[PDB]
Design a protein around this ligand. Structure first.
Ligand SMILES: CCCCCCCCCCC[C@@H](O)CC(=O)O[C@H]1[C@H](O)[C@@H](CO)O[C@H](OP(=O)(O)OP(=O)(O)OC[C@H]2O[C@@H](n3ccc(=O)[nH]c3=O)[C@H](O)[C@@H]2O)[C@@H]1NC(C)=O
Ligand SMILES: CCCCCCCCCCC[C@@H](O)CC(=O)O[C@H]1[C@H](O)[C@@H](CO)O[C@H](OP(=O)(O)OP(=O)(O)OC[C@H]2O[C@@H](n3ccc(=O)[nH]c3=O)[C@H](O)[C@@H]2O)[C@@H]1NC(C)=O
Ligand SMILES: [Cl-]
Ligand SMILES: [Cl-]
Lengths: 308, 308
């Protein structure tokens, strides 16, 4: 019994809740319970001269009442089927803060939230709230695209096999251990692949360094990837045919290869550490171009900027 | 001579630079100069065991050399025509920080940056870098959509006539003074409109307050808007026919009315103050649904989280 305590971030701008549906799918297969969470507010609450505290509180209670019933209406078939869904609507004017406090306080295992994709060939659309959650939520964040899961969809883990700091390796292990555990709890025959991407040197020759050959750097970075990739696949019983080390800009390559592999989801490590500033740069461009679900996972060391 | 010192944020992912084009259009009409700015980096720089400092610095200089020449190639017709364009490429792995430091240090009057719009009926697409700039840049931020400016396009100032704090009024004045000054420097006959939106109470009746009528609150908020709107239009010589006070959620109404008025641009006040937390909430949803250019302006009081 793991991943039993799921947090769904309800989207207030439409009725249907793909994040709720995904959570139900999970709980039907692995047990557990779901919190359907929505932070709400209203301009009237800030009109403190025009309205009295009692007037503003009447409006506040009205909004909570209405939104709670609206969520229940969306959840009603799931509820009747016996799925444990706790609806939680609270008064809060800074949604990302509200959501992350809920994660910390109730030790949620996964946060699930929908993201829109407009066209078949299109990238997921991320709001500023989505970005805040990706940057700051300490629990894994599952961005569910609002489209059908592809039949025979694969699960792609994007490892960082380039950067030299030891925390990358620990995070790569965490990604794959979690992907293997969770996928097997949900699917009868999960199809897990491992993927890395490395860019090449931006020069042909160095004016000050006559014996330097940048091609040898490209080959070394590739060889570093191949050794690390073999070690990962052996540790986690992934066949060599399902490992992929690819040359090019990661923010271009990883989305492209995910589409070539018919990925239902990409699993990605993201940090909080500030400086590896270029890693958050690459990561944000990569995410911003993904065309499938995203599962973003932080390292064990993560310190959330938000505290309760 | 004002608005003479323009900062263009170059987009590294395509050749054509709508932000540069817009800046040129401005300078041809109002004089001045342009800084075409791009912060660049490369993974090799962080590979400090695999590569030596000299090797990494060779790659660094190569990237700066190449990107500087690439910008010049895009700017070449403008340059030949006599437009003053200073190209500045620097090594930095956190673009939003680099850009804002440039604004602070050289006291740029305007930051201009392109945003994509995919369909005719579509919202502007904002990257995480765009959001960082909107949230944190102390100078006005002009997001230029990558589509033709509409013929006879209007200029719409979205005022906050709801919130009770006095800083809103000062910021409304700043928006209109700037819009009138800059538009007249650029266009021979600018078509400026003023727009406000207010939402209604979320209840019909209050259980604890038998004499309260929420409809009277809706009418009062409207009347507050009408008085403030008249004062603004008289101060800034805008005809009553070009003022619009509209009922509904601002993040829905303002984008919709901008389209109804054939806006080329919406001008919007945004803050840094943290708590008016609901204002940044509304503002982010509004921005995220705009279908025309955006000019985002901070108050005089603004304290930038970034310092040099
Ligand atoms: C390491 C991480 C990787 C692990 C691997 C993860 C693999 C995930 C694979 C996901 C597969 C995906 O297809 C699951 C899925 O969504 O299947 C639905 C199916 O695509 C649909 C159409 O064929 O049929 C079902 O969806 P429906 O929307 O038709 O039914 P429902 O059971 O979801 O909803 C019950 C009723 O409640 C209603 N409802 C539901 C949600 C809501 O917000 N509002 C609402 O009214 C809904 O309209 C419906 O009438 C199916 N619903 C469920 C829960 O299985
Ligand atoms: C309170 C705030 C509100 C104030 C009101 C603001 C109002 C703003 C109104 C803007 C109107 C808008 O139409 C201006 C505009 O973009 O007009 C272009 C016109 O839409 C185009 C097609 O009819 O013709 C022109 O654009 P081109 O791209 O054809 O010529 P150019 O002068 O911009 O470029 C010169 C050459 O350099 C080349 N170039 C330019 C940029 C670049 O990044 N790369 C490049 O190669 C380009 O391809 C071209 O061959 C016109 N270029 C200029 C500078 O006027
Ligand atoms: Cl299955
Ligand atoms: Cl004109």
């Amino acid at each position: 019994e793991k991943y039993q305590n799921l947090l769904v971030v309800i989207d207030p701008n439409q009725d249907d809740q793909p994040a709720l549906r995904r959570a139900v799918y999970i709980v039907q297969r692995n047990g557990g319970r779901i919190k359907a969470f929505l932070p709400v507010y209203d301009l009237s609450y800030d009109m403190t001269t025009l309205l009295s505290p009692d007037e503003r509180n009447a409006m506040r209670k009205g909004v909570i009442n209405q939104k709670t019933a609206w969520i229940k209406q969306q959840a009603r078939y799931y509820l009747e089927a016996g799925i444990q869904i706790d609806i939680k609507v609270i008064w809060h004017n800074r949604p990302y803060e509200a959501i992350i406090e809920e994660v910390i306080t109730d030790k949620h295992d996964l946060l699930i939230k929908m993201a829109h994709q407009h066209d078949k060939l299109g990238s997921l659309i991320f709001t500023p709230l989505d970005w805040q959650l990706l940057r700051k939520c300490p629990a894994p964040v599952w961005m569910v695209k609002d489209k059908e899961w592809p039949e025979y969809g694969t699960i792609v883990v994007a490892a960082n096999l380039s950067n030299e700091e030891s925390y990358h390796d620990a995070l790569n292990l965490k990604l794959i251990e979690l992907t293997n555990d969770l996928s097997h709890r949900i699917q009868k025959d999960p199809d897990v692949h491992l993927l890395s991407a490395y860019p090449v040197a931006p020069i042909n020759i160095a004016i000050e360094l006559p014996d330097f050959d940048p091609n040898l750097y490209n080959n070394a970075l590739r060889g570093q990837h191949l050794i690390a990739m073999k070690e990962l696949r052996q540790k986690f019983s992934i066949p060599e045919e399902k490992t992929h080390v690819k040359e090019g800009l990661p923010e271009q390559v990883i989305p492209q290869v995910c589409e070539e592999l018919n990925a239902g989801i990409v699993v990605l490590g993201i940090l909080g550490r500030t400086g590896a500033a270029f890693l958050g740069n690459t990561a944000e461009q990569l995410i911003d171009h993904i065309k499938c679900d995203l599962l973003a996972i932080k390292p064990d060391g993560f310190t959330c900027p938000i505290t309760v």
